[PDB]
Amino acid sequence: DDVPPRIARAMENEEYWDFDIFELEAATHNRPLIYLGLKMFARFGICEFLHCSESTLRSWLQIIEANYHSSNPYHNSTHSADVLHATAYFLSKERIKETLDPIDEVAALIAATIHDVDHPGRTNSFLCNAGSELAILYNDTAVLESHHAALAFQLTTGDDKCNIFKNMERNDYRTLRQGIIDMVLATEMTKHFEHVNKFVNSINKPLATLEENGETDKNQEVINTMLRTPENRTLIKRMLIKCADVSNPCRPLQYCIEWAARISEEYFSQTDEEKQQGLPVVMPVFDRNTCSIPKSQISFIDYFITDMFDAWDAFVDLPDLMQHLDNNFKYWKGLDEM
Ligand SMILES: CC(C)Cn1c(=O)n(C)c(=O)c2nc[nH]c21
Ligand SMILES: [Mg+2]
Numbered sequence: 001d002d003v004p005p006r007i008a009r010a011m012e013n014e015e016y017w018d019f020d021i022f023e024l025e026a027a028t029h030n031r032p033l034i035y036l037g038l039k040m041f042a043r044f045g046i047c048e049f050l051h052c053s054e055s056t057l058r059s060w061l062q063i064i065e066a067n068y069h070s071s072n073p074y075h076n077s078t079h080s081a082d083v084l085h086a087t088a089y090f091l092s093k094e095r096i097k098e099t100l101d102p103i104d105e106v107a108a109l110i111a112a113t114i115h116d117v118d119h120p121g122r123t124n125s126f127l128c129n130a131g132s133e134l135a136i137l138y139n140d141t142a143v144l145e146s147h148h149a150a151l152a153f154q155l156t157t158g159d160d161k162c163n164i165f166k167n168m169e170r171n172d173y174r175t176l177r178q179g180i181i182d183m184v185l186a187t188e189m190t191k192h193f194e195h196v197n198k199f200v201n202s203i204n205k206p207l208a209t210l211e212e213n214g215e216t217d218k219n220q221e222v223i224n225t226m227l228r229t230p231e232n233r234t235l236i237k238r239m240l241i242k243c244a245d246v247s248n249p250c251r252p253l254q255y256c257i258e259w260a261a262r263i264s265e266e267y268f269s270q271t272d273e274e275k276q277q278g279l280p281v282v283m284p285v286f287d288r289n290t291c292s293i294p295k296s297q298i299s300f301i302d303y304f305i306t307d308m309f310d311a312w313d314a315f316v317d318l319p320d321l322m323q324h325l326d327n328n329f330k331y332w333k334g335l336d337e338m
């Protein structure tokens with residue numbers, strides 16, 4: 001409701017892919033998540049679905065945001081707000097609206113918001129090599145992701161004023177909780193190819209086969225019937241959050257560059273600490289004294305981004321993202337100059 005002018009302007013056209021997330025960051029003084037969250041959640045009528053107070057929502061968003069470390073160059077609440085923005089953009093797509101149920105939407109927007117809560121700016125392999133308490137707690141398995149999901153629920157249901165799930169019927173909540181957990185866990189990168197390949201084999205290939213029969217009468221019905229099964233909506237949701245999570249390369253050039261600087265600095269920090277403690281260095285390439293950020297981005301894009309967005313774009317139709325990805329890939333290439 002009552003929001004300072006500058007912040008109101010910063011939340012300009014959050015519906016467009018081109019969005020100045022850094023101006024929101026500055027305007028909100030490192031509190032972009034509560035502002036974009038409230039607006040996004042309202043535009044999607046989430047409390048009206050969970051039966052919560054716009055006041056209980058604020059308390060929730062506030063506690064989740066506070067548990068994102070501002071000190072992290074990359075994994076701070078701004079990254080979360082950015083992922084939330086990409087998620088809403090995807091949910092707003094015809095293909096997605098025509099495939100997911102409102103409860104999947106709720107799961108996605110919430111998953112995006114909490115997916116990295118309390119991230120320490122270190123990778124899972126680092127926590128394991130160090131014997132960090134979280135690594136011991138989670139038996140060196142999907143350490144951070146399990147933690148984001150768990151801590152999130154502990155903060156939410158641990159206080160009546162934060163519990164945006166308080167007024168839900170056990171069954172509905174139970175299903176929403178499982179969906180949220182599934183999406184957060186799906187962000188662990190070691191499972192990257194498993195998730196993308198399943199999406200390609202169960203969504204893109206079968207759909208191309210049906211779309212060969214043209215776009216006639218019952219044809220479409222057969223298509224919509226197949227895409228809406230619980231199994232497929234799950235694979236679609238996993239793909240959606242994964243793509244929102246690493247969508248930086250598909251953003252306007254200025255933003256793309258900033259995101260690359262932030263994540264790189266976070267990785268360099270870790271490398272300096274690993275060698276300092278004599279711990280095994282996991283990202284030998286990510287050393288601030290040896291690593292070329294543009295070349296690293298190129299490799300990153302070729303390895304994870306290209307094929308994954310290829311598949312996502314074929315299913316949802318995202319020319320804007322693909323054009324940005326091409327332009328940015330060319331920029332990093334153009335910076336060679338040598
Ligand atoms: C290898 C990948 C899982 C981690 N990773 C990376 O290496 N670079 C360079 C990124 O920009 C990036 N953004 C998210 N994850 C990233
Ligand atoms: Mg994560």
Ligand SMILES: [Zn+2]
Nearest residue numbers: 083115116245
């Ligand atoms: Zn993330």
